[PDB]
Amino acid sequence: SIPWNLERITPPRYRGGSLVEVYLLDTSIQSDHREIEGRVMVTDFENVPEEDASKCDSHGTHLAGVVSGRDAGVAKGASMRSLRVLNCQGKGTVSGTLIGLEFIRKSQLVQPVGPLVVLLPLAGGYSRVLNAACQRLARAGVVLVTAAGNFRDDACLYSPASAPEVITVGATNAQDQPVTLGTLGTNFGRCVDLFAPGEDIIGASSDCSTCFVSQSGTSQAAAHVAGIAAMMLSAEPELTLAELRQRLIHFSAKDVINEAWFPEDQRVLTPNLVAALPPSTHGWQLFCRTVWSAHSGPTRMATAIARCAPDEELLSCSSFSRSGKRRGERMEAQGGKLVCRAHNAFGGEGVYAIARCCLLPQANCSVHTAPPAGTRVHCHHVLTGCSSHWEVEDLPNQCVGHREASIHASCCHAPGLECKVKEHGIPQEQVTVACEEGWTLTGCSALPSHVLGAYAVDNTCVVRSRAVTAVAICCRS
Amino acid sequence: TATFHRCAKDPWRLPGTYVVVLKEETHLSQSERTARRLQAQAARRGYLTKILHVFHGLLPGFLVKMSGDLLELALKLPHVDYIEEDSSVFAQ
């Protein structure tokens, strides 16, 4: 009887959402529906284009149900407030969406409540202003959950999916694979943060006050994450956006999607996560995420940059290029805060910077750098990452680089931190080394015979080559 | 330094309405005057405009219904950061 999606997001060990409010920006809703009646407050904010009765409120009633419905909802308690930014055909405007996000911020200022989750189950093309509005509303302390988009495309070309500081959800099906239907299906790419159930999702149906229907979409998937977030923020009201996003990542099922559904260039960029409620168990622990930069572009002096959240530490930095024409990566200070910067080589199509960002409080972290000479630096606390960058066009707690490159050590004064280094070499297109259970991969890199790049995938260090040795740095309390 | 942006997906563009976005520290009183100035300068040129909304709280700026002919004029207004042509969003 338990619908497949609600079982799917249930942790392997288990036992809400009421100090939290979930705002919904969607079509009108049938607030009388027994799934949601008494739970959803229609603000009657309305800003919609003109069309070109139960069809009208079908979308939003379903999603209101997926978040908070009493039989089929993720956060079965959950107060919701609904705004109407989509007309009866499901069409809205950027400007209307702007006014609704503005309306939520005015309400919060007039009548402060607790943690706020805004669900944006909608998409249009990349929009500077919509992304700006979403970010600034996030910086004001509000959590935004948005759908990746249903176009089987790069989510970074869509808004508010591409919006900075927002949680973008793609859709997976009952086989844990990305939804595909014809040429349509879930978006993907580095702007997607995780995936949630989004095919054949039973929820409230506006046909009648006790009726139910199945719908699919990345809206449905985001509705899952929004109810998941509402329960996390009920349990831990004080979470910052980085701390909630590190928990969503940590508690997701991992390496469960078959990356072959994604276009080749997007497999490395798309996170292999399916969202899940946290278990009954949860002492402090070390959370890290991998943060990919936008592609640098082809200019000869191009740099990609990857940044952590203000309350995260940059524990390592690497780079990747599909052709292998790259000049490595370095860590630099900006605003008293370390960022990850990758260098394009003259004649390459661009590179990615790949930061490893971790919630490590009480951490004083510094960089140790050595110029070209093989090249060596070391710390003199604990080594968390090795980086390397060169100026030429071709060829313990220590880092070692090519004789002609600089190398950089991320060194952290972190008492209570223990780190170990684990290596794996083979005679080979991809070489892999993973941290043991309970440890967190903080740093990944290849020993200096022609490397496309290295990047952390969860707790596995992955080195990509055209003897090759993968080197993983693993830490824990 | 002010720039214009419209949706790269042509069928989603909504010409005729523009989101005029102002520099981060711009005060509501300035937004209202900058909108009134646009209306004024457009009227001196023969264009009716309509200020559909003034933004404050997340972004300063305003939403104007006007012919695109005025984008060169509107981009030179005080406090302007960029202008974006409205476009569609869709249930997903």
């Binding site: 979308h59 998409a123 939804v179 719908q215 | 569609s88 869709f90």
Partner: peptide, 10 residues
Amino acid sequence: XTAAALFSFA
């Protein structure tokens, strides 16, 4: 669904 992958992928 027309004209944006709307309503369960059209």
